[PDB]
Amino acid sequence: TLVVTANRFEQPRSTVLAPTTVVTRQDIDRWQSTSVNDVLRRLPGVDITQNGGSGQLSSIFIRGTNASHVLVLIDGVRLNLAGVSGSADLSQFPIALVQRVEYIRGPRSAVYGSDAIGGVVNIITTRDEPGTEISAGWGSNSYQNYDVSCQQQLGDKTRVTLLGDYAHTHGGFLSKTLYGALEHNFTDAWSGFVRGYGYDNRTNDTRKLYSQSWDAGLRYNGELIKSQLITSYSHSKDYNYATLDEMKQYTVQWANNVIVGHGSIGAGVDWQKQTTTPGTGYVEDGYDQRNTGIYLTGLQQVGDFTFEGAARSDDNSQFGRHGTWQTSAGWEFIEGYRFIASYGTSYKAPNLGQLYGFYGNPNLDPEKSKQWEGAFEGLTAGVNWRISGYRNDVSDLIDYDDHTLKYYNEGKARIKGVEATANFDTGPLTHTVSYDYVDARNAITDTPLLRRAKQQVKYQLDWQLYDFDWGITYQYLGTRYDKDYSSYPYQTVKMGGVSLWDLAVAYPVTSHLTVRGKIANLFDKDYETVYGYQTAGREYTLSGSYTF
Ligand SMILES: CCCCCCCCOCCOCCOCCOCCO
Ligand SMILES: CCCCCCCCOCCOCCOCCOCCO
Numbered sequence: 084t085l086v087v088t089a090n091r092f093e094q095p096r097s098t099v100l101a102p103t104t105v106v107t108r109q110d111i112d113r114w115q116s117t118s119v120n121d122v123l124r125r126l127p128g129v130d131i132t133q134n135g136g137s138g139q140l141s142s143i144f145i146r147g148t149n150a151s152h153v154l155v156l157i158d159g160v161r162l163n164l165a166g167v168s169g170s171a172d173l174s175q176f177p178i179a180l181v182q183r184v185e186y187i188r189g190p191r192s193a194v195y196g197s198d199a200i201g202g203v204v205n206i207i208t209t210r211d212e213p214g215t216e217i218s219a220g221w222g223s224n225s226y227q228n229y230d231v232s233c234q235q236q237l238g239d240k241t242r243v244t245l246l247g248d249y250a251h252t253h254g255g256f257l258s259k260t261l262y263g264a265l266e267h268n269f270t271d272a273w274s275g276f277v278r279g280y281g282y283d284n285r286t287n288d289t290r291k292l293y294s295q296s297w298d299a300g301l302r303y304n305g306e307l308i309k310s311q312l313i314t315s316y317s318h319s320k321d322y323n324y325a326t327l328d329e330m331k332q333y334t335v336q337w338a339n340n341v342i343v344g345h346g347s348i349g350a351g352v353d354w355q356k357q358t359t360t361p362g363t364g365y366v367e368d369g370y371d372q373r374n375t376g377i378y379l380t381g382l383q384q385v386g387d388f389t390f391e392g393a394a395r396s397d398d399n400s401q402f403g404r405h406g407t408w409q410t411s412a413g414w415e416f417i418e419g420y421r422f423i424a425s426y427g428t429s430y431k432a433p434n435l436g437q438l439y440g441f442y443g444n445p446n447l448d449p450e451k452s453k454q455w456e457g458a459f460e461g462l463t464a465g466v467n468w469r470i471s472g473y474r475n476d477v478s479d480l481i482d483y484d485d486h487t488l489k490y491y492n493e494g495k496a497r498i499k500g501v502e503a504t505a506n507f508d509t510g511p512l513t514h515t516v517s518y519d520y521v522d523a524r525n526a527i528t529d530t531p532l533l534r535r536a537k538q539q540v541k542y543q544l545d546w547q548l549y550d551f552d553w554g555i556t557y558q559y560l561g562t563r564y565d566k567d568y569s570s571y572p573y574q575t576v577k578m579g580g581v582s583l584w585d586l587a588v589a590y591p592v593t594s595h596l597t598v599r600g601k602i603a604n605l606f607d608k609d610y611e612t613v614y615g616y617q618t619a620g621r622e623y624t625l626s627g628s629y630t631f
């Protein structure tokens with residue numbers, strides 16, 4: 084029920100007018116996900132493509148938007164792995180760290196700045212759940228996982244969290260994760276934290292990625308006033324063999340929010356520096372980019388109406404000043420039913436390669452989105468449902484000009500989509516269903532954009548019988564257009580749609596020991612999300628956790 088992703092501070096989801104999805108760790112353990120993509124692919128509006136199995140490059144297409152038009156936050160801060168390519172790829176991010184996901188669709192540059200065009204995915208790594216745990220798993224393709232985790236009180240008012248994880252999967256991918264946290268309450272209103280973690284990955288032509296992130300902050304959580312001051316530093320090193328991509332990202336943010344009337348008003352200032360090593364991302368020199376943004380947010384309930392807003396101004400060391408804004412109005416016209424209307428602008432900053440690489444244009448402006456969305460939400464006969472339509476006009480897309488061998492702002496895209504979701508129970512069965520239609524086109528030429536499913540259906544059915552907890556996952560991935568690079572001029576090819584099924588079980592052997600089982604791709608269906616790149620096939624997994 085609570086989220087922080089909408090305006091940075093806690094609020095109930097019912098008061099967030101944008102469609103909103105929350106995934107908890109209970110969900111991730113039940114689903115038996117061995118990657119971040121597997122979690123995300125289940126959610127509304129998400130279309131993930133991957134050059135094969137785990138560890139391989141991937142892209143996230145939220146609601147038809149480009150790969151680079153989703154904002155991935157880790158504990159509220161822009162994902163470091165995204166900064167060199169300017170495009171979020173979570174294949175290397177360790178699933179072991181994911182305690183919660185809050186995923187908000189629709190624009191949100193008016194709070195977060197760059198990249199929040201299709202939506203915002205915030206991966207949270209914090210848990211409140213004392214104790215010690217050991218866990219492990221084996222599966223198909225010699226998959227193997229071991230994991231030790233711990234959270235305990237060091238006296239009154241201070242807690243410590245530790246975790247280590249080893250994951251390995253042949254064709255392949257090797258991941259080692261370490262994470263520690265200290266949380267401290269100076270009073271019941273004032274809190275502080277220091278966090279550090281990092282991970283060492285190898286992917287097979289070989290890839291050796293290493294990242295470490297450190298975060299530190301103060302929060303004030305009062306009856307009316309809420310405040311946060313947060314510091315983050317990330318250092319990544321990305322070897323392909325040989326080529327080295329290295330980036331340091333520093334972040335400081337100060338936000339406040341106060342409860343006023345039946346809602347709130349907030350403001351903050353957001354500063355970001357990114358330094359890259361020479362040769363990073365096929366750019367010759369090392370670069371230092373800086374961004375500052377100041378934004379305002381507000382929520383109010385009057386009568387049957389809810390109004391939500393945000394507005395931001397970003398000053399970028401390369402393109403200068405760009406402003407964004409968004410509003411939503413919602414009207415509960417009969418109890419349990421609501422009509423919601425939203426408008427929002429957002430942007431994407433140019434990336435290092437586009438700006439300074441062999442074909443760079445140092446004068447590029449940001450890509451700009453205007454979105455309109457309308458929705459009906461309802462609770463009918465024990466069924467919670469919602470249906471939205473949205474229109475997204477993207478312009479000044481950064482395209483390569485083949486005649487002058489330089490990038491320019493010129494492209495246009497028009498995306499018209501529909502999202503429909505419902506959840507409900509039938510006796511002991513729980514159903515979670517969504518449907519997405521996404522008509523994403525080049526607006527000059529009126530031709531469909533490549534790499535995106537026009538349609539997806541997603542169905543989750545959970546139930547408990549003896550003490551077995553069962554979960555079935557269904558996905559239809561619709562027809563998709565891609566290019567075939569095996570032959571030049573590269574031809575556009577049509578990839579047929581596919582139905583995919585998973586089956587997962589959990590059993591508490593004792594009150595301390597849970598054993599779990601999964602068959603991913605129950606019908607050994609052969610398919611690609613990227614033309615040429617074979618996906619998994621039926622895989623089996625068998626795992627356990629021991630708590631004390
Ligand atoms: C005191 C400032 C609160 C508003 C900040 C964000 C406003 C963004 O644009 C809204 C203006 O245009 C639409 C007017 O309708 C509702 C305004 O938002 C009310 C916020 O609770
Ligand atoms: C806190 C509230 C923020 C609300 C912002 C409203 C949106 C700004 O639109 C007002 C008009 O916008 C510009 C129109 O004309 C000037 C620009 O056109 C020429 C291009 O440079």
Ligand SMILES: CCCCCCCCOCCOCCOCCOCCO
Nearest residue numbers: 350377378379394395396405406407408
């Ligand atoms: C207290 C923080 C207020 C931050 C508000 C900035 C709102 C962002 O602008 C709204 C969208 O931008 C539209 C106007 O952009 C053109 C800038 O005009 C500059 C003055 O000529």
Ligand SMILES: CCCCCCCCOCCOCCOCCOCCO
Nearest residue numbers: 417418419420421422458459460461463
């Ligand atoms: C696109 C949204 C359309 C929503 C239509 C809903 C209109 C009214 O629906 C519910 C009205 O209540 C009727 C339900 O049956 C009454 C149950 O009440 C129990 C005791 O009176």
Ligand SMILES: CCCCCCCCOCCOCCOCCOCCO
Nearest residue numbers: 457458459470471472473474499500501
């Ligand atoms: C109020 C939620 C809208 C539900 C949409 C389904 C009804 C379709 O009726 C009209 C046909 O729409 C044609 C275009 O379809 C994609 C449009 O998506 C919205 C952007 O305009």
Ligand SMILES: CCCCCCCCOCCOCCOCCOCCO
Nearest residue numbers: 468469470501503504505516517518520
């Ligand atoms: C869907 C229009 C009817 C009113 C909303 C009912 C709630 C929808 O919840 C079910 C979501 O499940 C799949 C719905 O698929 C059909 C809707 O697609 C329409 C595309 O234009």
Ligand SMILES: *SCC1=CC(C)(C)N(O)C1(C)C
Nearest residue numbers: 232233234235237243244245
């Ligand atoms: S949960 C981490 C932890 C708690 C305590 C028992 C105090 N420790 O020595 C470690 C650091 C293992």
Ligand SMILES: [Mg+2]
Nearest residue numbers: 225251252253
């Ligand atoms: Mg091995």
Ligand SMILES: [Mg+2]
Nearest residue numbers: 269270273274
């Ligand atoms: Mg203090």
Ligand SMILES: [Mg+2]
Nearest residue numbers: 305306307308
């Ligand atoms: Mg107070």
Ligand SMILES: [Mg+2]
Nearest residue numbers: 301310311312
């Ligand atoms: Mg403070």
Ligand SMILES: [Mg+2]
Nearest residue numbers: 334335354355
């Ligand atoms: Mg500073």
Ligand SMILES: [Mg+2]
Nearest residue numbers: 424425456457
């Ligand atoms: Mg509308």
Ligand SMILES: [Mg+2]
Nearest residue numbers: 484485486487
């Ligand atoms: Mg010519």
Ligand SMILES: [Mg+2]
Nearest residue numbers: 538561562580
């Ligand atoms: Mg189809």
Ligand SMILES: [Mg+2]
Nearest residue numbers: 607619620621
């Ligand atoms: Mg096979």
